Design a protein around this ligand. Structure first.
Ligand code: STE
Lengths: 45, 45, 45, 45, 45
C-alpha cells in the first residue's frame, strides 16, 4: 500500500512533540534565569 | 514504491526518540524547579 | 492526493521549531554559564 | 530514485544526531538531580 | 511543481540545526557538571 499518508502522520506527530519540547524548554529557561538571579542575591555569596 | 518503507522507518525511530526527549525534559524542568525552590528557602542566602 | 505539498509544510514547521529551540538553548547555556561563574566566586565556599 | 536516496540519508543522519541528543540529555538530568540533592542536603541552608 | 529538491534542502537544514543543538548541549552538560562539582567542594555546605 501507499506509505505516504503514514509518513505525513509521523511528521505531524514529530512537530507535535517538538512543539511540546519548545514550550518546556521555554519554561525551563525562565526557571534557570530565576535560579541565577536568586543565587546572585545570595548573601552567603 | 520508492524508499518509502525505509524513510517511514527513520521517521518512526525519530518520533520514538523525540517522545523520550520530551519526557526527559519534562522531568528535568521539574528537578530544576525543585532546585530553584530549595535555593529560595536557603537560610544561607 | 499528492501529499508532497503537505509534507513540505511539515518539514518547514519542523525547522522553524528547531530554530526557536536552538535560540532558547543558546540563551539557556549563557544563563547556566553565568550561574556557574557566580557560584565559583561565592564567598561561602 | 531521484532524490529519495539522498532524503533517506538525511533522515538517517537525523536519527543518529537525535540518539546523541538523547544520551546527552540523559546524562544532563543525572547531573541536575545530583545537584538538586546536593543543595537540598546542604547544611548552610 | 516538483517539491523534492526543496524537501531535500529542508532535511539538510534540519541536520545542520540538529548539529548545532548537539554542540550546544554537549557544552551545556560541561557547564552543568562544573557547577555540580563546584557546589560539592563548597565549604559552606
Ligand atoms: C523529517 C524528520 C523530523 C526531524 C525532526 C528532528 C527532531 C527535533 C529534535 C529536537 C531536539 C531538541 C532537544 C532538546 C534540547 C535540550 C534542552 C535542555 O537543555 O534540556
Amino acid at each position: 500500500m501507499d506509505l505516504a499518508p503514514q509518513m505525513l502522520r509521523e511528521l505531524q506527530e514529530t512537530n507535535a512533540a517538538l512543539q511540546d519540547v519548545r514550550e518546556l524548554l521555554r519554561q525551563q529557561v525562565k526557571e534557570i534565569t530565576f535560579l541565577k538571579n536568586t543565587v546572585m542575591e545570595c548573601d552567603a555569596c
